[PDB]
């Protein structure tokens, strides 16, 4: 299933490479050590509501 099974456990972008899940993030985010989560590089990252 890979990316079809819960987005490949990716926070954002899911790709399939050499029959495996490869995650990536939009600009302003860095991919975490686990290669799954996306970490904002600074204040006001894209697509986050400013509720706090």
């Amino acid at each position: 299933k890979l990316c079809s099974l819960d987005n490949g456990d990716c926070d954002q972008f899911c790709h399939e490479e050499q029959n495996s899940v490869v995650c990536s993030c939009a600009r302003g985010y860095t991919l975490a050590d686990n290669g799954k989560a996306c970490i904002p590089t600074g204040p006001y990252p894209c697509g986050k509501q400013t509720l706090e």
Binding site: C3, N7, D11, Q12, F13, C14, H15, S24, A26, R27, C38, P43, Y44, P45, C46, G47, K48, Q49, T50, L51, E52
Partner: protein, 234 residues
């Protein structure tokens, strides 16, 4: 927006408002970065000279957090025509960068395939704007939002009098009398994925507003990502 709910503090930070010489909102926009606004091409005919208001939630009251930005470059899609409403997309480069704060933050641009397989396949997206609250009405002074179901491509074309091209998509309700309206044009259609809002559409047109058996027509943002990317380099 007909029906829906008001955008509460910090809920729709990517909303931009195109304002004319008379300082009245006429179209919406999406904040992409500190220098770029995404809007509909048809919006560029609604006013001779226009500025971009950000962080505005209520037009009657100067919030302080609101900022007006002048447009340096208007990057309009050459394939746009009022005859078909196809390619209803434009990118605006601002003279000064937007200051990100509460109610001022950009929406994410997704990657093409993932947006199509993962975002477009979600049950709903959120449309927002300062457009008409009833088909026959005045522009809203309050920023509104509305969760709209993604509509099946076949149902979409059957619902319409006009040709629904591959650069367009339907969203809305067949019976529930809530939808975007005149003035919401060029505004955001965003799809939430794990608490991150990605820009999926540009309010384009509709046969009146909130009419039964009809939907909101949006410019499919995925179809113009490279064009969008290229525009942000100029």
């Amino acid at each position: 927006i007909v029906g829906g709910q008001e955008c509460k503090d910090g809920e729709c930070p990517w909303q931009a408002l195109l304002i004319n010489e008379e300082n009245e909102g006429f179209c919406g926009g999406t904040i992409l970065s500190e220098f770029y606004i995404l809007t509909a091409a048809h919006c560029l005919y609604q006013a001779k000279r226009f500025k971009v208001r950000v962080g505005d939630r209520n037009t009657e009251q100067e919030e302080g957090g609101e900022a007006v930005h002048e447009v340096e470059v208007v990057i309009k899609h050459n394939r746009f025509t009022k005859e078909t409403y196809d390619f209803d997309i434009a990118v605006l480069r601002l003279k000064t960068p937007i200051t990100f704060r509460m109610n001022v933050a950009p929406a994410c641009l997704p990657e093409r395939d993932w947006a199509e397989s993962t975002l477009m396949t979600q049950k709903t997206g959120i449309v927002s704007g300062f457009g008409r609250t009833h088909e026959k009405g005045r522009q809203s002074t309050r920023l509104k939002m509305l969760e709209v179901p993604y509509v099946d491509r076949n149902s979409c074309k059957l619902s319409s009098s006009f040709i629904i091209t591959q650069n367009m998509f339907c969203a809305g309700y067949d019976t529930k009398q809530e939808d975007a309206c005149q003035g919401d044009s060029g505004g955001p259609h965003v799809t939430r994925f794990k608490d991150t809002y990605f820009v999926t559409g540009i309010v384009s047109w509709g046969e009146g507003c909130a009419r039964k058996g009809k939907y909101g027509i949006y410019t499919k943002v995925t179809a113009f990502l490279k064009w969008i990317d290229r525009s942000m380099k100029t």
